[PDB]
Design a protein around this nucleic acid. Structure first.
Lengths: 106, 124, 155, 204, 203
RNA sequence: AAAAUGAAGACAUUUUAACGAGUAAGGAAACGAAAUGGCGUAAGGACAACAAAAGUAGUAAAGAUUUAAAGUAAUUUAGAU
RNA sequence: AUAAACAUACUUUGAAUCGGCCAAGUCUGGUAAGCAGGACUGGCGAUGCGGGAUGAACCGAACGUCGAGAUAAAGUGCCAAA
RNA sequence: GGAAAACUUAAAAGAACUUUGGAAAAAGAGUGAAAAGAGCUUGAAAGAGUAAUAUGUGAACGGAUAAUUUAUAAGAAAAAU
């Protein structure tokens, strides 16, 4: 109906050269090209909506979501840190997430 | 009321090389080799039982229902926990016959004690 | 020796078995795998072509040194042989089971080979006199065979 | 959402390595790329130096079996795929999937010849190069090493330029009439209320 | 007296010890679970202590964009704040948007600069009593089963009061039509087109 | 380690503070504020329904296969066959 | 001057060990050696972790089980976080 | 010089008649509390066979983190004055 979100790319987890900490996920919000535009998005909602091909004998929904929040910037290029209720599956790397306009402060 | 029972490690501490050889069982044994990959705590293989893994003293040995297990062999052994039915749960031993099980199961209902083997050796 | 599986409806099944059969396990294990699931009439035709070397038995698992043949196209196996002795033994058990079905009163034209399983048996030892004053073992490879025929019905 | 549209990169007047590095990173970010005219990319060094580097590259080869050895692709569309594949993860599903969304062509083929082309400013040869430094088109180097289809491409590109010449001329005629027709609506008095709104915000 | 840990229960003629009283003198007590006290009911005028502080941009008569929930993207007019819940009582005038009278928490709205003001909106009712009156509750647990048709009849019954209380729309609708293009603005969804980056979007 | 409490609760008490890597090697048992804490195999002497029929067992023991639970771990417990 | 009461002084009984190896704003024999032998200290042996692509010794820093942050050596075109 | 090899059941009641097969045997039938069926109490691991399920480019296995599927699994009380 209407677009009320900004597409964000799940680049990967907060890691080191030979380590990886899947508790914090890194996102690239479309339109943020510097760390001085991130303060708007600190605290906004983020959802990882995905589709599962359920069977006709299951009541499990075909559309599910994992929700989280943006907590801090990550480097001088407008990359963010997002903490989710359940850590995103690494099979979802490079996929698109939703950055909502709420909880609004405007 | 029931406290939040927190476990620091829900897996099992398997023996080293237990997955590769069938003569080495899965029961844990600290490796005492001079070149052992595990006892030297390498990257990847550095999982050993330590005292720090122990769970909280408040909730130790507590069943998920929130009560402590208490084995009983007869109806008389139930009377030892009838004052503490909010702390202990009965447990009919594995060798107790089906006849003696009905008396234990019935009596615990009279004394308001939770039995965890209430569905054991039930007839056809 | 018991049976690996029991039929769903004992009233519509027939059984036959052989214990300590003096036939190679690896040859009879591969033959039995070929006739699994086909109708009794088709199976008896397949086992007869194998005897006169007109249809192949694909040796799928035990194919070390087994030569390639022209009849093994379409079976995803490049190797096959024509074990006669194992084919004959199964032919006698398939006949025995069919006579058991007829006595029960089942329609032979409807039966299929639903279950057929081969298991290893106790071997017999013999001497092979090698060089430098040695003796080796010259051991048989017998097997047990179980057969169950059940009528095919829609589900 | 899902990125189904394809980013088209016009590899004309770009640097081979700097295009690959930006393309390789964004392949891991789920984007779909199609680099057309991958034969017009430029590399540093004259033709003689490029041949010395190529001859050294051709040396690496499995001694006991050259058919197992390194395969030295000579088509420029394969000189960019090799460059991009070097910058992507090796021997995992993440690397294979990222490379599955990449294509070079030696020109603009049928579906990608009428698509919105993009550019990578970091990889532009006019920014990263001293103008006096001598370069080499990947197509010119390909011919010197055995790429047979260099003159087939030059024929196809020539017919693409001439077909876009008539489409652009016809489009420029229509767009001029549409622009002049709009100026009459702007000057019209019935649309005075709407025009004032546009003038207020500078759109007019 | 009985010990604190002794709650005698009836025995179905089964064997009992000597000390256990016979059931003819045993009276059962209904099992009790709840122990906390529900919220006290106060004056309709006085506000609850748990009252959120509204942002300075949200003032009565403003036009808000709902960015979450069922009416995501719709535009509503902010009448007043529910003192008993801290939620905003907004009406996205039903004759224009189709958004009825409802309570929405202040974190799911954006306070635009555009204002319709409108005093004399006749908010005599429209409070905790009204919203609790028209809310569609479930059929509880022991109150039979009553599937399917139970929810439909609730809406039919609450429809007459829900429609009646929408009389608040009479004046704001008139003021909305006064400003040019304002009717279209509210009647349409709010969408993020290409190039509208929220960190740059100002309303 | 130091304070407080202490015939029996219990989780080998309560509080505060500092500390915890490790081959060869050492720290036997007992020791109420316990001079390290525990698991398992087998046999011997006791204890095991306190009101004169007193641990379990043909209403299915030991053993075997697995499913779950408790324990950091050694292991223990229970269900099904 | 500074530090030191879980400080200090120990007594008894006893285990393992005395094949060592490396570094260097060090030395001796040797053309020289990843050679042979020494003075002082630190390490490896007995030692994992982050970095140097990989490495017994190099640099940072020594380890009960976890969460959140500020860091160290060193890095920020892609593989690879910046 | 110098071994190996214990156990059906309470009782042989150790199938006994029919069909297929050259025969051994098999399928019915019958005994017995139960085939425990004589290679006979129970019947592990290594090795196989059948069925169900799932996976795949020059090893396989292990660990941390999530997703999918399956399994386990938490309730009968009830507000203000």
């Amino acid at each position: 109906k209407c677009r009320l979100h900004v597409n964000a790319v799940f680049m990967g987890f907060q890691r080191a050269q030979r380590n990886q900490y899947p508790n914090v996920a890194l996102l690239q919000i479309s339109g943020v090209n510097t760390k001085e535009d991130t303060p708007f998005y600190i605290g906004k909602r983020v959802a990882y909506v995905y589709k599962v091909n359920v069977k006709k004998g299951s009541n499990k929904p075909a559309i599910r979501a994992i929700f989280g929040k943006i907590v801090a910037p990550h480097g001088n290029h407008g990359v963010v840190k997002a903490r989710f209720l359940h850590n995103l599956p690494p099979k979802a790397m490079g996929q698109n997430l939703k950055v909502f306009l709420y909880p609004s402060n405007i | 009321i029931k406290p939040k029972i927190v476990k620091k490690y829900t897996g099992h501490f398997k023996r080293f090389d237990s997955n590769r050889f069938l003569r080495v069982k899965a029961s844990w044994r600290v490796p005492r080799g001079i070149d052992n990959r595990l006892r030297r705590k390498f990257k990847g293989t550095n999982l050993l039982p330590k005292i720090g893994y122990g769970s909280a003293k408040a909730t130790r040995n507590m069943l998920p229902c929130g009560l402590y297990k208490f084995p009983v062999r007869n109806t008389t052994d139930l009377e030892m926990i009838m004052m503490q039915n909010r702390k202990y749960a009965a447990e009919i031993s594995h060798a107790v016959s089906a006849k003696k099980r009905q008396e234990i199961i019935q009596r615990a209902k009279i004394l308001n004690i939770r039995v965890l083997n209430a569905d054991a050796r039930i007839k056809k | 020796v018991k049976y690996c599986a029991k039929p769903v409806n004992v009233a519509k099944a027939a059984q036959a078995r052989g214990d300590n059969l003096k036939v190679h396990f690896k040859n009879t294990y591969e033959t039995a795998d070929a006739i699994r699931g086909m109708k009794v009439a088709r199976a008896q035709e397949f086992l007869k072509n194998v005897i006169i070397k007109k249809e192949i038995v694909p040796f799928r698992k035990h194919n070390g040194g087994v030569g390639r043949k022209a009849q093994c196209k379409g079976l995803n196996c490049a190797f096959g042989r024509w074990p006669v002795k194992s084919a004959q033994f199964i032919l006698k058990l398939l006949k025995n089971a069919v006579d058991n079905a007829k006595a029960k009163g089942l329609n032979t034209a409807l039966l299929t080979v639903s279950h057929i399983a081969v298991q290893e048996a106790r071997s017999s030892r013999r001497r092979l006199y090698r060089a430098h004053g040695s003796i080796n073992s010259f051991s048989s490879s017998p097997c047990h065979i179980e057969l169950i025929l059940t009528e095919k019905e829609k589900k | 959402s899902t990125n189904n549209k394809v980013t088209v990169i016009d590899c004309h007047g770009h640097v081979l390595g700097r295009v690959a590095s930006v393309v390789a990173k964004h392949l891991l970010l789920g984007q779909k790329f199609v680099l057309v005219r991958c034969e017009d990319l430029q590399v540093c060094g004259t033709l003689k130096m490029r041949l010395v580097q190529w001859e050294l590259y051709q040396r690496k080869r499995v001694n006991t079996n050259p058919t197992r050895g390194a395969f030295h692709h000579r088509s420029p569309a394969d000189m960019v795929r090799k460059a991009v594949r070097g910058m992507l993860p090796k021997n995992n599903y993440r690397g294979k999937l990222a490379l599955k969304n990449l294509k070079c062509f030696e020109g603009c083929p049928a579906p990608y010849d009428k698509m919105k082309k993009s550019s990578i400013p970091e990889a532009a040869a006019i920014y990263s190069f001293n103008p006096t430094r001598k370069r080499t088109l990947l197509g010119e180097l390909g011919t010197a090493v055995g790429w047979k289809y260099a003159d087939v491409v030059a024929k196809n590109e020539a017919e693409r330029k001439e077909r876009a010449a008539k489409w652009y001329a016809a489009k420029q005629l229509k767009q001029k009439a549409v622009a002049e027709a709009k100026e009459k609506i702007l000057a019209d008095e019935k649309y005075k209320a709407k025009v004032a709104i546009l003038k207020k915000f500078g759109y007019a | 007296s009985a010990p604190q840990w002794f709650v005698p229960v009836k025995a179905g003629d089964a064997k009992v010890p000597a000390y256990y009283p016979t059931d003819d003198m045993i009276q059962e007590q209904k099992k009790k679970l709840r122990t906390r006290k529900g919220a006290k009911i106060t004056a309709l005028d006085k506000p609850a202590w748990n009252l959120e502080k509204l942002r300075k941009s949200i003032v009565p008569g403003a036009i808000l964009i709902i960015v979450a929930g069922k009416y995501a993207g719709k535009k509503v007019v902010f009448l007043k704040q529910c003192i008993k819940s801290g939620a905003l009582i907004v009406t996205g005038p039903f004759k224009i948007n189709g958004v009825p009278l409802m309570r929405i928490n202040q974190r799911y709205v954006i306070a635009t600069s555009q204002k319709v003001d409108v005093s004399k909106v006749d908010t005599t009712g429209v409070d905790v009593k009204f919203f609790k009156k028209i809310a569609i509750k479930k059929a509880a647990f022991g109150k039979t089963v009553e599937e399917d048709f139970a929810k439909k009849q609730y809406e039919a019954k609450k429809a007459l009061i829900v429609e009646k209380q929408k009389q608040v729309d009479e004046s704001i609708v008139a003021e909305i039509k006064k400003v040019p293009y304002l009717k279209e603005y509210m009647a349409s969804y709010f969408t993020l087109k290409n190039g509208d980056h929220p960190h740059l979007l100002k309303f």
